Design goal:
With 276 residues, the protein is of the alpha+beta class. The protein folds into 2 domains: 93 residues, Phosphorylase Kinase, domain 1, CATH 3.30.200; 183 residues, Orthogonal Bundle (Transferase(Phosphotransferase), domain 1). It has 8 helices and 9 strands. The strands form 3 sheets. Strands 1-2-3-5-4 form a 5-stranded antiparallel beta sheet, with no helix packed on it. Strands 6-7 form a two-stranded antiparallel ribbon. α3 packs antiparallel against α5. The longest helix has 19 residues. The protein is globular, with a radius of gyration of 19 Å. The structure holds phosphomethylphosphonic acid adenylate ester. Phosphomethylphosphonic acid adenylate ester binds next to loops. Belongs to the protein kinase superfamily. TKL Ser/Thr protein kinase family. ROCO subfamily. This is Probable serine/threonine-protein kinase roco4.
């Protein structure tokens, strides 16, 4: 169930849109004075081929997945708008995890890192406890939005951008692109199936990037085919630093296991991370 907002129920402020299927605007709900992000669906008729205009299904997939999710560590969908088709999402004020980690002169302090780690873990835990489980398929640092970087804040990090997300009681397949973040069983061929355990692998890469501030696999340089082979067949993984807490190292290593079934349930992951 998703409520409908009219053009008068919200007021626009500005644009900040790097949108995949349109434009993103900042705005406010007239009722709450609540700050809000507006994601529009813009079909460029003078832009793309009839196969490219299948970004409609992405906008759709997002709406469908978002309508069932209600968790503090997942970006909330307030409602839907028409003409154009628009998603009304809560505004997350501190940017995303990818851009914040680029700032080397200002490293995130240890306690805040843990808040971020646990925040994302709780979000994904929620996703995997759904019936059927939510497979995000695009878990990476740009898709983690930062609510606050204060260690005592209610919510520090939120999971976002469920556009390529799949929710099926059966098996899910499809070759994914962004290989440095994605499970080995998702990057080799479309001809093989995978589960929500792929997200558990992606999460390990997110744990690594928070811990080191560095891009996963940035320490290596291979051609695409050689890179995919190493990850799949030779167990190529980013190097966990020697000073990393023993319990965090174990969580990361189990979460990026080549064998998907060895990647832990998030009840275990949350518990382990909370002991850090
Ligand atoms: N709820 C929100 N709160 C604050 N900013 C948001 C937001 N939703 C989107 N944005 C911003 O609007 C822009 C739109 O990006 P979008 O959400 O479409 O991801 P994307 O698909 O562009 C990631 P990539 O470029 O890697 O594919 C981003 O810069 C993001 O920071």
């Amino acid at each position: 169930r998703l409520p409908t907002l009219a053009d008068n129920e919200i007021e626009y402020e500005k644009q900040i849109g790097k949108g995949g299927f349109g434009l993103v605007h900042k705005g406010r709900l007239v009722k709450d004075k609540s700050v809000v992000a507006i994601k529009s669906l813009i079909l460029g008729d003078s832009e793309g081929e009839t196969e490219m205009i299948e970004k409609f299904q992405e906008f759709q997939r997002e709406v469908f997945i978002m309508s069932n999710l209600n968790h503090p560590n997942i970006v909330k969908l307030y409602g839907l708008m028409h003409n154009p088709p628009r998603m009304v999402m809560e505004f997350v004020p501190c940017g995303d995890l990818y851009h914040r980690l680029l700032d080397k002169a200002h490293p995130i302090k240890w306690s805040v890192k843990l808040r971020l780690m646990l925040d994302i873990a709780l979000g994904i835990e929620y996703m995997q406890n759904q019936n059927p489980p939510i497979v995000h398929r695009d878990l990476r640092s740009p898709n983690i939005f930062l609510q606050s970087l204060d260690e005592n804040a209610p919510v520090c990090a939120k999971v976002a951008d469920f556009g390529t997300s799949q929710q099926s009681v059966h098996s899910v397949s499809g070759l994914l692109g962004n290989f440095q973040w994605m499970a080995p069983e998702t990057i080799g061929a479309e001809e093989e199936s995978y589960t929500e355990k792929a997200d558990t692998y992606s999460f390990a890469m997110i744990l690594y990037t928070i811990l080191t501030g560095e891009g996963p696999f940035d320490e290596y340089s291979y051609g695409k085919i050689k890179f995919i082979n190493m990850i799949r067949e030779e167990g190529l993984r980013p190097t966990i630093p020697e000073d990393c807490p023993p319990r965090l190292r174990n969580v990361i290593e189990l979460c990026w296991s080549g064998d998907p079934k060895k990647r832990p349930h998030f009840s275990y992951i949350v518990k382990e991370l909370s002991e850090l």
